[PDB]
């Protein structure tokens, strides 16, 4: 009876930096995945372990919507079995990922004349991220073995890096808002279905 609030996710006013990616759980509602899949707004709408076509025939315990901004160059990384700064240090999907990656170009909102540098990605981490892990640390990162604790040397780095979103940049360098929908089928009853 209740329509799932996908507008609150896809049409949000502000968007998280990828390092601090936002998550919204949705349940106890009904979703028509083709009003979205057949909207012409989205530049990328790919799924994994499931197929975009049959999305309404499926029924899940809960669905998670994760949203954030990255470069166009890095939409390839929001995928199972990928590596690179984003998959490695920012947003990791599991290799048995079931769900959908939806992305659209957002130059018109997320850049400014002179450049928008409000979006951050993590450049440095001691280890790769486990699937769906989320690190918002600002601890100084030690590169090499000269220690950084206390008095801090040259090989000591603030972990987060600004994106430089210039209006005139190449389409790979431009910001993309990205939504990942994860389909959690448990051993409990289903709450998110098709029409």
């Amino acid at each position, epitope marked *: 009876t209740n329509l799932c609030p996908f507008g609150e996710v896809f049409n949000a006013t502000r968007f998280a930096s990828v390092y601090a990616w936002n998550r919204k759980r949705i349940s106890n509602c009904v979703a028509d995945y083709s009003v979205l899949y057949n909207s012409a707004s989205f530049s990328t709408f790919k799924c994994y372990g499931v197929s975009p076509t049959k999305l309404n025939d499926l029924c899940f315990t809960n669905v998670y919507a994760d949203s954030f901004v990255i470069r166009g160059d890095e939409v390839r990384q929001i995928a199972p079995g990928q590596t690179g700064k984003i998959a490695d240090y920012n947003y990791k999907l599991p290799d048995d990922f079931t769900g959908c990656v939806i992305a659209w170009n957002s130059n018109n909102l997320d850049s400014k004349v*002179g*450049g928008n*540098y409000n979006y951050l990605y993590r*450049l440095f981490r001691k280890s790769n991220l486990k699937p769906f892990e989320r690190d918002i640390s600002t601890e*100084i990162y030690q590169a090499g073995s000269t220690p950084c604790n206390g*008095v*801090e*040397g*040259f*090989n*000591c*780095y*603030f972990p987060l*890096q*600004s*994106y*430089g979103f*210039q209006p005139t*940049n*190449g389409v790979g*360098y431009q910001p993309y808002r990205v939504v990942v929908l994860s389909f959690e089928l448990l051993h409990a009853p289903a709450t998110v279905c098709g029409p």
Partner: nanobody, 119 residues
């Protein structure tokens, strides 16, 4: 359009003082970490000092802590390196760099400024 211009340097007696400036064009110097490197003759490049984005800290090599001071002028879009208590092993060519991580179409590696400290 994006460019890094070093200025200052020259000849100074040991114990002397000097200030090098790095004038950036095409981006704001506060957004990313900015660095000073030096390459003595017949040695490899060494990291001297760095100032992180947005006042997230400064970093100083052991060789020059307490004698060198790095700073940002957001109005002049310029990073400065004050050089005090100059020892002679501080003789090198000095280079500034942006740790932009590919976030701008840079032509990444490029002139430098020579500093010479007498005995």
């Amino acid at each position: 359009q994006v460019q890094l211009v070093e200025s200052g340097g020259g000849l100074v007696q040991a114990g002397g003082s000097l200030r090098l400036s790095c004038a950036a064009s095409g981006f704001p110097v506060e957004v990313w970490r900015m660095e000073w490197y030096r390459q003595a003759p017949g040695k490899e490049r060494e990291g001297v000092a760095a100032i992180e984005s947005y006042g997230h800290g400064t970093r100083y090599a052991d060789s020059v802590k307490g004698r060198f001071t790095i700073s940002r002028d957001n109005a002049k879009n310029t990073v400065y390196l004050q050089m005090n208590s100059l020892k002679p092993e501080d003789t090198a060519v000095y280079y500034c760099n942006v740790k932009d991580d590919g976030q701008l179409a840079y032509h990444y590696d490029y002139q430098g400024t020579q500093v010479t400290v007498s005995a």
